[PDB]
Amino acid sequence: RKIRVGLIFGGKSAEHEVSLQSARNILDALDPQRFEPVLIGIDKQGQWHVNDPDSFLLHADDPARIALHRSGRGVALLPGAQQQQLRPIQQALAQIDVVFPIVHGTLGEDGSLQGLLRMANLPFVGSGVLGSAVAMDKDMAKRVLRDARLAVAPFVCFDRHTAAHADVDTLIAQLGLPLFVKPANQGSSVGVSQVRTADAFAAALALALAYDHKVLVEAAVAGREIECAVLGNAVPHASVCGEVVVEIVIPADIDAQTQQRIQQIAVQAYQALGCAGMARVDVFLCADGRIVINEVNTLPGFTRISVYPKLWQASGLDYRGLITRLIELALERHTDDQLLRSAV
Amino acid sequence: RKIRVGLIFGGKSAEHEVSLQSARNILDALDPQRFEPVLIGIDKQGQWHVNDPDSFLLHADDPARIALHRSGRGVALLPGAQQQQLRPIQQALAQIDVVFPIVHGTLGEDGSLQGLLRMANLPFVGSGVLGSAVAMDKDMAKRVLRDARLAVAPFVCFDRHTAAHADVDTLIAQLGLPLFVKPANQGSSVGVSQVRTADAFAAALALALAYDHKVLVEAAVAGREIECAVLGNAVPHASVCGEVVVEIVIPADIDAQTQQRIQQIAVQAYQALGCAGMARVDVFLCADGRIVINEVNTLPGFTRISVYPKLWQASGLDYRGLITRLIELALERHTDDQLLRSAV
Ligand SMILES: Nc1ncnc2c1ncn2[C@@H]1O[C@H](COP(=O)(O)OP(=O)(O)O)[C@@H](O)[C@H]1O
Ligand SMILES: Nc1ncnc2c1ncn2[C@@H]1O[C@H](COP(=O)(O)OP(=O)(O)O)[C@@H](O)[C@H]1O
Ligand SMILES: [Mg+2]
Numbered sequence: 001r002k003i004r005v006g007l008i009f010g011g012k013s014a015e016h017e018v019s020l021q022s023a024r025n026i027l028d029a030l031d032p033q034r035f036e037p038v039l040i041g042i043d044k045q046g047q048w049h050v051n052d053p054d055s056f057l058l059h060a061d062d063p064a065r066i067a068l069h070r071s072g073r074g075v076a077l078l079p080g081a082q083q084q085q086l087r088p089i090q091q092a093l094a095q096i097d098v099v100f101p102i103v104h105g106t107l108g109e110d111g112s113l114q115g116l117l118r119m120a121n122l123p124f125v126g127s128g129v130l131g132s133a134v135a136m137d138k139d140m141a142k143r144v145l146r147d148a149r150l151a152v153a154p155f156v157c158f159d160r161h162t163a164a165h166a167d168v169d170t171l172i173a174q175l176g177l178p179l180f181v182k183p184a185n186q187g188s189s190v191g192v193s194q195v196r197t198a199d200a201f202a203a204a205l206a207l208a209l210a211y212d213h214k215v216l217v218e219a220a221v222a223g224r225e226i227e228c229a230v231l232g233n234a235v236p237h238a239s240v241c242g243e244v245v246v247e248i249v250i251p252a253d254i255d256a257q258t259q260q261r262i263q264q265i266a267v268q269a270y271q272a273l274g275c276a277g278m279a280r281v282d283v284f285l286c287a288d289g290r291i292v293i294n295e296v297n298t299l300p301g302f303t304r305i306s307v308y309p310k311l312w313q314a315s316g317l318d319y320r321g322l323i324t325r326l327i328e329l330a331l332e333r334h335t336d337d338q339l340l341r342s343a344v
Numbered sequence: 345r346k347i348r349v350g351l352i353f354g355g356k357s358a359e360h361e362v363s364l365q366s367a368r369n370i371l372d373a374l375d376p377q378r379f380e381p382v383l384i385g386i387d388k389q390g391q392w393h394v395n396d397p398d399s400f401l402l403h404a405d406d407p408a409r410i411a412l413h414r415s416g417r418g419v420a421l422l423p424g425a426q427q428q429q430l431r432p433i434q435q436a437l438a439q440i441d442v443v444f445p446i447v448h449g450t451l452g453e454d455g456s457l458q459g460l461l462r463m464a465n466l467p468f469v470g471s472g473v474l475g476s477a478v479a480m481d482k483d484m485a486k487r488v489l490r491d492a493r494l495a496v497a498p499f500v501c502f503d504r505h506t507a508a509h510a511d512v513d514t515l516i517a518q519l520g521l522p523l524f525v526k527p528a529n530q531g532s533s534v535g536v537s538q539v540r541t542a543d544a545f546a547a548a549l550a551l552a553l554a555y556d557h558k559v560l561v562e563a564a565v566a567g568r569e570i571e572c573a574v575l576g577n578a579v580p581h582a583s584v585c586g587e588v589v590v591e592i593v594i595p596a597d598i599d600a601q602t603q604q605r606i607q608q609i610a611v612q613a614y615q616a617l618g619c620a621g622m623a624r625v626d627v628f629l630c631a632d633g634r635i636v637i638n639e640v641n642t643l644p645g646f647t648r649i650s651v652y653p654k655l656w657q658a659s660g661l662d663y664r665g666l667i668t669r670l671i672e673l674a675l676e677r678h679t680d681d682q683l684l685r686s687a688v
């Protein structure tokens with residue numbers, strides 16, 4: 001009867017500490033009538049550690065010092081195993097029935113961890129391989145959004161083989177100034193540059209390319225910053241909207257009608273990229289206002305102060321209840337998948 | 345100095361026996377001056393077995409009976425481990441320096457296995473998570489191809505939630521007859537149906553949906569069936585073309601010019617979907633002849649009789665040499681990646 005939730009958290013990421021806090025928040029909200037937690041922390045070097053609920057954090061109550069307890073209790077995965085897929089090197093680890101992965105950084109978000117979890121036959125919360133891979137690659141994501149006739153910022157994408165040939169002038173004639181230079185990998189916020197003059201571009205292009213093999217160059221979008229939370233698998237729902245002021249305001253100070261059409265856009269974007277479980281969608285609401293999609297994010301924050309849970313809160317969905325729904329959604333997909341993976 | 349090549353093969357697939365033969369062919373061609381093999385077979389139930397080069401097949405020399413030796417020597421993966429990532433449950437397994445995965449079926453081809461290999465920090469041959477996930481999903485693949493202004497067959501895509509509402513008439517007005525009904529998952533060839541009359545459609549739609557949650561309905565493309573092999577990472581090359589007659593003919597009986605523009609299309613398609621290592625591209629060459637892309641396949645066959653190696657053979661690239669290049673390409677990507685995965 002009780003479901004065992006393997007929480008996998010942290011990771012090699014600038015947002016590592018956000019994942020620690022999220023795990024602690026999730027762990028306090030998990031309905032203890034339905035779920036027992038099992039905890040696997042991933043350190044800043046990518047090493048996996050089992051921990052007990054009680055003792056998994058160092059300096060828990062200090063945001064400047066908070067760290068993972070690197071217990072050194074290692075984990076082995078048995079690919080193609082059907083039970084006890086997760087194993088202690090050295091013990092026994094509780095059977096995991098569903099994984100809630102909140103690993104920030106490339107591997108935790110780009111589909112790679114999701115593919116490990118599939119290979120271990122583990123149900124798991126959030127987008128599968130494809131939705132995660134596509135969303136995380138801002139170039140592919142915008143192309144799939146574009147084809148779906150949703151608006152995204154006009155943009156050009158360079159690799160290192162192709163950046164050598166960049167002509168600023170032609171870029172400015174096509175996209176204008178300022179230009180936002182971004183590495184295509186979504187995680188996170190690093191290597192970005194707002195280029196104001198044609199002359200600051202080379203340096204932006206070069207910084208970005210230290211982070212990914214692909215760098216986007218985007219035209220400016222002028223307008224307000226709205227964020228909307230999406231939940232579900234086949235029939236996704238949308239939360240109320242929140243406006244980023246510059247500091248988030250929930251619900252947003254916009255028309256009921258405008259909210260509805262951003263809600264609808266958030267859902268169509270989510271379907272087009274093949275997301276499941278959860279995403280936060282970030283749009284620009286122009287003066288017209290066309291709605292232009294900035295980002296589809298398949299790993300939102302789950303702290304008490306994070307936007308995604310705040311948006312569900314303001315929509316009548318409580319934090320405990322959010323978490324429970326994410327788990328039911330993971331188990332529903334899994335058992336639907338189960339039936340499908342029957343070839344001859 | 346010698347590189348250790350972990351060959352992972354078989355899988356839960358109708359094409360399981362093709363993977364056995366491929367592994368045997370690869371193993372005989374592997375340059376023994378540069379590479380030692382390590383063998384991991386995956387059985388029809390998805391279980392992993394280490395085997396010795398000498399004794400990995402049952403009834404090797406009989407195509408009707410050939411099977412994997414289920415040695416029962418299990419494998420554990422240490423995610424985030426940096427050496428000995430692959431481990432015997434029960435021994436020692438040789439350090440693997442590069443993985444050559446030829447696992448047919450969903451998990452081996454759709455990016456999931458590739459994500460496990462990333463999580464284990466293992467370089468590996470063929471497309472990474474995204475290129476595999478995208479190529480394997482025929483719906484997403486055609487949308488990305490479409491956006492890249494390459495021609496694909498006109499098509500509509502249904503899920504079970506949406507198939508209930510299918511109107512044949514509107515489908516026929518838009519796409520014509522016959523209609524090819526396909527589950528969106530690329531592997532492989534199963535659940536396909538050629539629907540000749542409006543009346544055979546419901547049944548096709550229903551069979552397909554037993555295999556995937558998404559089913560494509562495609563207009564007919566009238567024209568010749570050309571296949572072209574692609575190799576490389578950042579600067580992919582194309583082989584000579586082969587024509588499927590109805591039985592493959594290499595090289596194809598087509599103009600030098602026509603060959604060149606199918607070659608160019610095969611490469612652009614490969615870039616657009618984010619493929620690496622290898623793909624076979626299958627097109628239709630119409631009477632006009634526009635070239636229309638049928639399939640981008642990121643896991644071609646590697647038997648002696650498979651098309652992909654035959655195409656390189658006829659282009660001056662030998663089988664041993666193909667295999668060696670695929671490995672150098674895997675190691676090159678890996679070490680480029682290495683530098684990138686440096687966040688703060
Ligand atoms: N094309 C653009 N036009 C206008 N503003 C942009 C554009 N791209 C990014 N921004 C601004 O950059 C800020 C951060 O960019 P964002 O895409 O959110 O990257 P990250 O989320 O990683 O910081 C956003 O708050 C938005 O104000
Ligand atoms: N839209 C289409 N128009 C014309 N022929 C098609 C179409 N789709 C499939 N075919 C035919 O179906 C055969 C097999 O389809 P294919 O896409 O190759 O599936 P699989 O490779 O899994 O058999 C091809 O040889 C081609 O002749
Ligand atoms: Mg954003």
Ligand SMILES: [Mg+2]
Pocket residue numbers: 626638639
């Ligand atoms: Mg084909």
